[PDB]
Amino acid sequence: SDQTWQPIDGRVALIAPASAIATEVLEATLRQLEVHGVDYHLGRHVEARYRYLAGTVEQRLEDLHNAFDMPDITAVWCLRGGYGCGQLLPGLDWGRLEAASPRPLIGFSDISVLLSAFHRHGLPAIHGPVATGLGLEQQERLASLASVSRLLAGIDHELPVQHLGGHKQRVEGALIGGNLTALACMAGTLGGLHAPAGSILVLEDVGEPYYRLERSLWQLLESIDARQLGAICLGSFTDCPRKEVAHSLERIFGEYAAAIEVPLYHHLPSGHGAQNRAWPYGKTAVLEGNRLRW
Amino acid sequence: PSSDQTWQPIDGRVALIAPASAIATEVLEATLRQLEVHGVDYHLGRHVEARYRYLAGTVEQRLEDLHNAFDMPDITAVWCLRGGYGCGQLLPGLDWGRLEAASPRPLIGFSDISVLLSAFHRHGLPAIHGPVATGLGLQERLASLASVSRLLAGIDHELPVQHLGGHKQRVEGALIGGNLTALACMAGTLGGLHAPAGSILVLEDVGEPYYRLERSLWQLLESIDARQLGAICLGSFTDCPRKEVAHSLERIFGEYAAAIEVPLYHHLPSGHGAQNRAWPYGKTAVLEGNRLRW
């Protein structure tokens, strides 16, 4: 059953590399982790505030590095996205991270920037709910949160997806992407999306008018070797007001996919709505039939 | 000497084009009537009334008009009708040789048009950051509109500024920049900001919460040789809601300017408010005390 958590072996490091956390949401999160018998390590600066950021870059870097020093940690679950994790990229000690035993980094939204950087450096990661999702359709939300422990245990390996137009085909490549806006906002920097040839580019977003999505897509595709992608795979675009625009969002995305001669898929249950099922970031997967399979 | 509301004659013909967002018919008509009141001979691009979603026609249609503005021998300025979104889309197909072959005809606009201003500067073509032509068809506003003809005629040479941070010595370099969001959205692409060493980076924006401004600023500065800039000079940040954020906008921009060790000025009367005085894009200027001069 998909609301059922798997035990998480070892300990989960909780860090806040992006936006600041409300105290009551943090405590509610920890109580839910305890319900589920999850042993955790709370980063020492998770309650820090520096404007809307979870502390200074230096504070966030200390917590992320500490998460990689402890030997019993088997996963690093980001508490909140929002904005700010790209700021850490010029300070990360990548060598200290490759040397630690495997511990997938977990999150979505702004955390997409760190997922991509991790993939570039050969480190495991998971695109899924941030841990404060625990402390906030309700059935779908609960299945999404449960999906993290289930993926860490290796017991889920597929999601449903639909091919939009085109023709029947099989696409195999690395799973990359996440939040369109966050990733576009790293183009031209050291944190630009890692997009090896053949990759399946997953995109989702929230809270944007269509012209801002198009602008972001144009930038992202112009900044990578787009024509060498295997596929573009849309998750959800939630709370994105159409405002009388003549073309649907799928028409716009379809025009871009056609321009680069890459197939377009959609309805992956991934993003900012109730459906946000975890998927392994940077692994080889296959688009076949009605699913994405790893 | 003349009042800032007093236009100068524009000799020859002004090409009106719409390389970004679509144009409302009534606003266009009022624009043309104001040009006629001022004795300005104009030519409307064949596709300026095109619509393709929110864009002023397809890429091919807009390229046809832009190219035509450089093919016609009697055109002495190219005044963009509206910004909004879309002119970066023209960069892949733009024939620079065709533009460079034509007699001098400054490109005028702001907002999204900043993207084209920068590309023109990279190709040694004259340009002006100031009101788009539809601003005519909608006292400080009138002075802003008059400043275009006055700058084409070469009679205005300075704008007021105020020092905000960093060293107080004279800065001399090329005037670059414009809209922060639009320029950040070209980072990592063929249309990225042309930012030669020593430049004075002007920035303005509208309608953004502070975290989005910071995200754009971090991207733009990380994507250029920021440390080699001469200065950052802020225009207006119009309708940018603070919403309880603990740090002021001046504090945030101060922190970034300090991080790259570049002096920071503000209160340039340039942007999306009533104060949008024209300045020469890509021209060498001097920033000293309470003035920017060229």
XYZ file of C-alpha atoms in Angstrom:
588
model
C 0.000 0.000 0.000
C 1.248 3.494 -0.906
C 0.464 5.325 2.403
C 2.676 2.792 4.188
C 6.169 3.956 5.058
C 9.194 1.656 4.942
C 11.562 1.798 7.919
C 14.521 4.065 7.192
C 17.748 2.264 8.033
C 20.238 4.390 9.961
C 19.704 8.057 10.590
C 18.225 10.945 8.532
C 20.046 14.294 8.586
C 17.675 17.242 8.466
C 19.021 20.494 7.029
C 17.609 23.802 5.837
C 19.777 24.981 2.898
C 17.235 27.418 1.403
C 14.304 29.284 3.103
C 13.798 29.741 6.838
C 11.434 27.470 8.783
C 8.483 28.350 11.019
C 8.978 26.967 14.515
C 5.595 25.223 14.749
C 6.032 23.556 11.339
C 9.463 22.270 12.383
C 8.178 20.799 15.642
C 5.190 19.213 13.838
C 7.611 17.713 11.318
C 9.784 16.148 14.016
C 6.736 14.706 15.762
C 5.621 13.022 12.516
C 9.110 11.613 11.915
C 8.984 10.165 15.444
C 5.508 8.592 14.768
C 7.184 6.745 11.957
C 10.207 5.598 14.016
C 12.619 7.697 11.955
C 15.843 8.437 13.840
C 17.116 11.893 12.809
C 19.925 14.354 13.247
C 18.692 17.968 13.376
C 21.137 20.464 11.865
C 22.395 23.004 14.429
C 21.320 26.030 12.380
C 17.939 24.850 11.089
C 16.095 27.603 13.045
C 18.414 30.394 11.858
C 16.964 33.338 9.964
C 18.701 35.834 7.705
C 15.952 37.722 5.965
C 13.898 34.888 4.309
C 16.948 32.537 4.171
C 17.627 29.800 6.765
C 20.701 31.611 8.091
C 23.818 32.888 6.351
C 25.539 30.883 3.635
C 28.199 30.006 6.214
C 25.595 28.600 8.659
C 23.889 26.518 5.965
C 27.201 25.201 4.682
C 28.205 24.127 8.197
C 25.002 22.098 8.558
C 25.271 20.491 5.100
C 28.962 19.559 5.686
C 28.112 18.163 9.127
C 25.450 15.945 7.539
C 28.230 14.340 5.513
C 30.651 13.902 8.469
C 28.468 11.679 10.661
C 28.927 7.949 9.825
C 25.416 6.747 10.668
C 23.583 9.069 8.243
C 21.892 7.295 5.320
C 19.824 10.175 3.885
C 19.904 13.984 3.941
C 16.343 15.312 3.839
C 16.046 19.026 3.115
C 13.433 20.664 5.366
C 12.214 23.402 3.003
C 12.855 24.723 -0.500
C 11.716 28.224 -1.435
C 14.901 30.080 -2.330
C 18.564 30.035 -1.442
C 20.349 26.701 -1.868
C 22.181 27.759 -5.016
C 23.999 30.266 -2.822
C 25.854 27.333 -1.212
C 27.433 26.032 -4.423
C 30.629 28.162 -4.253
C 31.285 26.890 -0.696
C 30.673 23.152 -0.919
C 33.581 20.780 -0.212
C 32.785 18.231 -2.891
C 35.640 15.934 -1.875
C 34.299 15.612 1.641
C 30.983 14.639 0.097
C 32.286 11.888 -2.277
C 34.215 10.336 0.639
C 31.153 9.878 2.890
C 29.087 6.678 2.672
C 26.096 7.067 0.329
C 23.303 9.264 1.695
C 20.835 10.544 -0.907
C 19.942 14.198 -0.803
C 16.123 14.696 -0.841
C 13.958 17.625 -1.838
C 12.249 19.528 -4.665
C 11.425 23.110 -5.644
C 14.578 25.218 -5.077
C 16.377 22.062 -3.918
C 16.395 20.991 -7.591
C 19.528 23.179 -7.920
C 21.353 21.014 -5.344
C 20.005 17.771 -6.887
C 21.558 18.765 -10.219
C 24.891 19.744 -8.602
C 24.950 16.451 -6.744
C 24.342 14.509 -9.978
C 27.222 16.443 -11.628
C 29.499 15.283 -8.758
C 28.292 11.646 -8.826
C 26.315 11.906 -5.595
C 22.906 10.236 -5.084
C 19.775 12.303 -4.821
C 15.965 12.116 -4.825
C 13.423 14.580 -6.211
C 10.551 14.467 -3.730
C 8.759 16.230 -0.891
C 10.736 18.379 1.519
C 10.477 17.190 5.120
C 8.277 20.048 6.389
C 5.596 18.642 4.115
C 5.031 16.401 7.144
C 4.168 19.358 9.387
C 1.543 21.211 7.323
C -6.078 15.043 -1.853
C -4.836 14.624 1.735
C -4.471 10.916 0.866
C -2.366 11.808 -2.178
C -0.224 14.080 0.025
C 0.298 11.262 2.530
C 1.266 8.806 -0.238
C 3.733 11.397 -1.587
C 5.369 11.769 1.812
C 5.501 7.994 2.285
C 7.145 7.655 -1.139
C 10.477 8.973 0.191
C 11.059 6.144 2.694
C 9.780 3.674 0.087
C 12.275 4.865 -2.529
C 15.175 4.892 -0.022
C 14.362 1.221 0.603
C 14.167 0.529 -3.140
C 10.586 -0.817 -3.157
C 9.046 1.645 -5.694
C 10.529 1.835 -9.222
C 7.911 3.403 -11.559
C 5.450 6.269 -12.085
C 2.625 6.697 -14.586
C 3.150 9.159 -17.487
C 1.415 10.004 -20.798
C 3.106 10.763 -24.154
C 1.808 14.055 -25.627
C 1.525 13.797 -29.421
C 4.439 12.388 -31.401
C 4.701 8.644 -31.991
C 5.260 5.515 -29.850
C 8.858 5.267 -28.734
C 11.171 4.115 -25.982
C 13.399 6.741 -24.349
C 16.214 5.791 -21.931
C 18.443 8.248 -20.076
C 19.320 9.988 -16.824
C 16.438 11.592 -14.873
C 17.176 15.287 -14.388
C 15.317 18.509 -13.745
C 12.648 19.555 -11.248
C 11.492 23.111 -10.840
C 11.653 25.056 -14.108
C 12.030 28.536 -12.546
C 14.709 27.505 -10.041
C 16.808 25.784 -12.660
C 16.489 28.587 -15.231
C 17.616 30.970 -12.483
C 20.954 29.076 -12.352
C 21.690 29.239 -16.069
C 25.011 30.911 -16.785
C 26.353 30.091 -13.312
C 28.330 27.302 -11.688
C 24.967 25.748 -10.763
C 23.545 25.428 -14.237
C 21.575 22.213 -14.858
C 23.649 19.104 -15.461
C 22.155 17.710 -18.703
C 24.078 14.827 -20.232
C 23.078 13.589 -23.635
C 19.986 11.457 -23.701
C 18.594 12.733 -20.403
C 14.908 12.818 -19.504
C 14.251 16.408 -18.417
C 11.440 16.530 -15.841
C 9.844 19.959 -15.373
C 7.245 21.202 -12.886
C 6.377 24.641 -11.542
C 4.006 26.724 -9.372
C 2.707 30.251 -9.108
C 3.759 31.643 -12.514
C 1.921 33.301 -15.430
C 2.511 31.599 -18.766
C 4.909 34.256 -20.186
C 7.256 33.736 -17.215
C 7.191 29.949 -17.787
C 7.962 30.405 -21.485
C 10.809 32.832 -20.719
C 12.243 30.318 -18.216
C 11.928 27.458 -20.685
C 13.545 29.426 -23.493
C 16.465 30.245 -21.198
C 16.852 26.707 -19.858
C 16.743 25.080 -23.290
C 19.082 27.704 -24.833
C 21.584 27.102 -22.004
C 21.931 23.317 -22.376
C 22.408 20.928 -25.269
C 18.646 20.651 -25.690
C 18.651 18.846 -29.020
C 20.501 15.936 -27.374
C 17.887 15.360 -24.689
C 15.961 12.096 -24.751
C 12.678 13.624 -23.663
C 10.930 16.428 -21.817
C 8.570 15.069 -19.135
C 6.106 17.453 -17.527
C 4.958 17.120 -13.958
C 2.376 19.501 -12.601
C 2.043 23.245 -13.169
C -0.075 24.312 -10.260
C -1.440 27.732 -9.423
C -0.163 29.029 -12.786
C -2.790 31.554 -13.889
C -3.662 31.460 -17.587
C -5.056 35.081 -17.596
C -6.790 35.052 -21.057
C -3.676 33.682 -22.788
C -4.686 32.234 -26.194
C -2.462 29.140 -26.016
C -2.554 26.440 -23.387
C 0.563 25.698 -21.444
C 0.858 22.339 -23.210
C 0.636 24.040 -26.607
C 3.518 26.322 -25.603
C 5.664 23.475 -24.231
C 4.795 21.411 -27.340
C 6.092 24.132 -29.637
C 9.432 24.123 -27.781
C 9.735 20.325 -27.794
C 8.966 20.328 -31.531
C 11.608 22.979 -32.181
C 14.342 20.813 -30.604
C 12.881 17.567 -32.014
C 12.517 15.889 -28.625
C 9.371 13.978 -27.516
C 7.099 15.464 -24.886
C 5.451 13.598 -22.022
C 3.133 14.914 -19.306
C 1.010 14.126 -16.229
C 3.971 12.791 -14.207
C 2.733 12.926 -10.584
C 5.520 15.238 -9.456
C 5.441 18.862 -8.367
C 3.758 21.350 -5.983
C 0.277 19.827 -5.824
C -0.952 16.874 -3.784
C 0.819 14.470 -6.158
C 4.536 14.664 -5.512
C 5.875 11.133 -5.762
C 9.630 10.671 -5.278
C 11.899 9.723 -8.148
C 15.646 8.983 -8.160
C 17.615 11.936 -9.409
C 20.396 11.218 -11.894
C 19.655 7.520 -12.460
C 18.934 5.873 -15.832
C 15.189 5.409 -16.427
C 13.030 4.367 -19.348
C 9.961 5.974 -20.827
C 7.990 2.965 -22.097
C 4.279 2.525 -22.692
C 2.328 4.369 -19.990
C 5.161 4.710 -17.399
C 8.516 6.026 -16.341
C 10.509 3.072 -14.964
C 13.850 2.826 -13.165
C 18.509 76.019 -22.871
C 15.061 74.432 -22.888
C 12.612 72.858 -20.461
C 12.898 69.103 -19.959
C 9.371 68.805 -21.461
C 10.527 70.346 -24.756
C 11.221 67.922 -27.585
C 13.932 68.334 -30.155
C 13.149 67.763 -33.835
C 13.888 64.244 -35.142
C 15.099 64.377 -38.742
C 14.539 61.504 -41.151
C 12.208 58.655 -40.349
C 11.706 56.628 -37.125
C 11.116 52.917 -37.610
C 8.530 51.609 -35.158
C 8.817 47.883 -34.461
C 7.379 45.439 -31.895
C 10.024 42.786 -31.136
C 8.513 41.632 -27.817
C 4.900 41.809 -26.561
C 1.821 42.572 -28.612
C 0.434 46.115 -28.981
C -3.118 47.324 -28.186
C -4.734 49.068 -31.161
C -5.953 52.172 -29.343
C -2.609 52.693 -27.594
C -0.905 52.427 -30.967
C -3.247 55.036 -32.452
C -2.658 57.518 -29.622
C 1.088 56.899 -29.982
C 1.019 57.829 -33.662
C -1.022 60.964 -32.978
C 1.584 62.173 -30.458
C 4.370 61.498 -32.948
C 2.426 63.562 -35.506
C 1.908 66.384 -32.976
C 5.725 66.498 -32.632
C 6.393 66.411 -36.383
C 8.045 62.986 -36.271
C 7.931 61.021 -39.521
C 7.509 57.320 -38.738
C 7.265 53.952 -40.454
C 5.270 51.090 -38.843
C 6.580 47.618 -39.333
C 4.323 45.377 -41.428
C 3.770 43.058 -38.423
C 3.503 45.465 -35.490
C -0.169 44.538 -34.960
C 0.471 40.764 -35.111
C -0.529 38.578 -32.175
C 0.817 35.144 -31.337
C -0.287 34.511 -27.795
C 1.148 37.514 -25.838
C 3.975 38.017 -28.375
C 3.808 40.542 -31.234
C 3.694 37.763 -33.869
C 6.042 34.886 -34.550
C 9.797 35.073 -34.385
C 9.861 35.133 -38.184
C 7.395 38.072 -38.347
C 9.324 40.110 -35.780
C 12.645 39.369 -37.490
C 11.201 40.535 -40.762
C 10.277 43.912 -39.221
C 13.584 44.313 -37.380
C 15.593 43.499 -40.480
C 13.404 45.848 -42.549
C 14.136 48.726 -40.144
C 17.835 48.327 -41.145
C 17.145 47.827 -44.875
C 15.244 51.102 -45.372
C 17.750 53.884 -46.219
C 15.946 56.877 -44.614
C 15.531 55.504 -41.103
C 17.470 57.443 -38.437
C 16.171 55.718 -35.251
C 14.479 52.397 -34.394
C 12.004 52.966 -31.588
C 10.625 49.813 -30.028
C 6.907 50.051 -29.350
C 6.652 47.831 -26.260
C 8.807 45.649 -24.040
C 7.116 43.015 -21.909
C 8.572 39.721 -23.139
C 10.046 38.253 -26.297
C 12.874 40.116 -27.973
C 15.532 37.637 -26.852
C 13.789 35.096 -29.021
C 15.045 37.050 -32.084
C 18.714 36.698 -31.281
C 19.379 33.273 -32.897
C 18.115 34.471 -36.300
C 19.307 38.071 -36.288
C 21.551 38.982 -39.225
C 24.193 41.190 -37.574
C 25.979 41.885 -40.889
C 22.761 43.368 -42.289
C 22.325 45.591 -39.235
C 25.984 46.738 -39.201
C 25.903 47.580 -42.920
C 23.181 50.206 -42.390
C 23.780 53.861 -41.590
C 23.579 54.693 -37.831
C 20.066 54.429 -36.371
C 19.940 54.056 -32.564
C 17.680 51.340 -31.124
C 15.462 52.725 -28.330
C 13.563 51.042 -25.507
C 13.709 49.546 -22.001
C 12.354 46.692 -19.915
C 12.592 43.477 -22.047
C 14.236 45.593 -24.791
C 17.339 45.764 -22.486
C 18.211 42.352 -23.982
C 18.463 43.829 -27.468
C 20.276 46.960 -26.191
C 22.990 44.716 -24.761
C 23.271 42.668 -27.944
C 23.526 45.890 -29.985
C 26.352 47.133 -27.723
C 28.195 43.798 -28.218
C 27.974 44.387 -32.005
C 29.038 48.053 -31.819
C 25.586 49.431 -32.713
C 24.126 52.537 -31.073
C 21.285 52.253 -28.621
C 19.317 54.211 -25.971
C 17.727 52.935 -22.741
C 14.517 54.952 -22.366
C 10.746 54.901 -22.812
C 9.179 52.577 -25.374
C 7.132 54.406 -27.969
C 3.726 53.326 -26.652
C 4.485 55.341 -23.513
C 3.385 58.282 -25.713
C -0.060 56.803 -26.339
C -1.093 56.181 -22.734
C 5.124 66.253 -15.759
C 7.891 63.706 -14.970
C 6.388 61.290 -17.533
C 6.347 63.977 -20.219
C 9.969 64.888 -19.466
C 10.834 61.176 -19.741
C 9.173 60.930 -23.166
C 10.812 64.130 -24.417
C 14.234 62.862 -23.329
C 14.432 60.452 -26.244
C 14.393 63.119 -28.974
C 16.671 65.276 -26.777
C 19.240 62.516 -26.416
C 19.138 61.637 -30.167
C 19.962 65.321 -30.756
C 22.861 65.162 -28.262
C 21.738 68.022 -25.993
C 21.399 66.192 -22.684
C 24.505 64.904 -20.922
C 23.747 64.063 -17.284
C 21.406 62.496 -14.759
C 21.306 62.776 -10.931
C 22.459 59.899 -8.697
C 23.420 59.369 -5.049
C 26.321 57.301 -3.690
C 25.156 54.378 -1.504
C 28.099 52.048 -0.858
C 31.725 51.250 -1.607
C 34.467 53.659 -2.646
C 33.637 57.236 -3.611
C 36.209 57.709 -6.400
C 35.291 58.511 -10.007
C 34.145 55.566 -12.127
C 34.448 55.698 -15.938
C 33.110 52.948 -18.203
C 30.400 51.858 -20.611
C 26.777 52.240 -19.499
C 25.113 48.820 -19.575
C 22.124 47.058 -18.060
C 18.465 47.939 -17.640
C 15.859 45.547 -16.314
C 17.299 43.130 -13.771
C 14.793 40.327 -14.349
C 14.970 40.447 -18.173
C 18.798 40.377 -18.180
C 19.032 37.591 -15.567
C 16.679 35.589 -17.846
C 19.311 35.607 -20.633
C 22.184 34.350 -18.510
C 23.693 31.166 -19.971
C 22.412 31.981 -23.452
C 23.671 33.651 -26.629
C 21.914 36.832 -25.369
C 23.654 37.153 -22.027
C 24.480 40.699 -20.874
C 27.501 42.188 -22.593
C 29.501 43.353 -19.500
C 33.017 44.454 -20.380
C 35.462 45.328 -17.628
C 34.886 48.712 -16.081
C 31.230 49.043 -17.051
C 28.594 50.913 -15.078
C 25.788 48.383 -14.574
C 22.436 50.146 -14.335
C 19.616 48.097 -12.800
C 15.898 48.786 -12.422
C 12.843 46.583 -11.925
C 9.110 46.435 -11.252
C 6.571 44.218 -9.512
C 8.869 41.781 -7.720
C 9.100 40.546 -4.114
C 12.560 40.850 -2.620
C 13.500 37.137 -2.864
C 12.890 37.183 -6.645
C 15.064 40.311 -7.002
C 17.828 38.652 -4.988
C 17.603 35.431 -7.043
C 17.902 37.442 -10.255
C 20.764 39.550 -8.879
C 22.715 36.501 -7.662
C 22.308 34.880 -11.118
C 23.206 37.979 -13.096
C 26.334 38.770 -11.060
C 27.507 35.136 -10.939
C 27.036 34.936 -14.720
C 29.259 37.939 -15.640
C 32.684 39.133 -14.533
C 31.107 41.064 -11.758
C 34.297 41.813 -9.838
C 35.637 43.688 -12.891
C 32.619 46.050 -13.125
C 33.224 49.736 -12.509
C 30.013 50.267 -10.562
C 26.386 49.330 -9.980
C 23.887 52.159 -10.383
C 20.290 51.575 -9.271
C 17.284 53.074 -10.951
C 13.856 52.648 -9.528
C 12.349 49.475 -8.054
C 8.662 50.297 -8.635
C 5.873 48.339 -6.933
C 8.305 45.870 -5.391
C 6.497 44.898 -2.220
C 8.670 44.499 0.874
C 6.067 42.347 2.708
C 7.672 42.282 6.210
C 11.112 41.234 4.851
C 13.616 42.052 7.616
C 16.222 43.586 5.301
C 15.644 46.625 3.078
C 16.286 46.533 -0.630
C 19.208 48.939 -0.127
C 20.660 46.510 2.417
C 20.351 43.561 0.033
C 21.894 45.380 -2.949
C 24.573 46.800 -0.597
C 25.512 43.303 0.533
C 25.880 42.074 -3.049
C 27.882 45.113 -4.182
C 30.169 44.704 -1.185
C 30.654 41.002 -1.999
C 31.956 41.808 -5.497
C 33.819 44.951 -4.257
C 32.125 47.326 -6.646
C 30.727 50.758 -5.678
C 26.972 51.198 -5.488
C 24.911 54.256 -6.510
C 21.140 54.728 -6.499
C 18.285 57.144 -7.290
C 19.004 57.202 -11.021
C 15.715 58.468 -12.557
C 15.390 55.421 -14.809
C 12.812 52.614 -14.609
C 9.109 51.756 -14.648
C 7.785 54.773 -12.753
C 7.154 58.321 -13.831
C 10.900 58.958 -13.887
C 12.378 57.205 -16.951
C 14.948 59.519 -18.428
C 16.856 58.275 -21.462
C 20.515 57.345 -21.233
C 22.947 56.315 -24.012
C 23.428 52.552 -23.980
C 26.995 51.338 -24.362
C 28.451 54.858 -24.300
C 31.345 55.697 -21.942
C 30.079 57.600 -18.899
C 31.439 59.029 -15.660
C 29.916 58.446 -12.260
C 31.201 60.936 -9.637
C 29.524 62.577 -6.638
C 25.837 63.153 -7.349
C 25.982 62.908 -11.192
C 26.241 60.395 -14.022
C 27.631 62.205 -17.086
C 28.432 61.331 -20.695
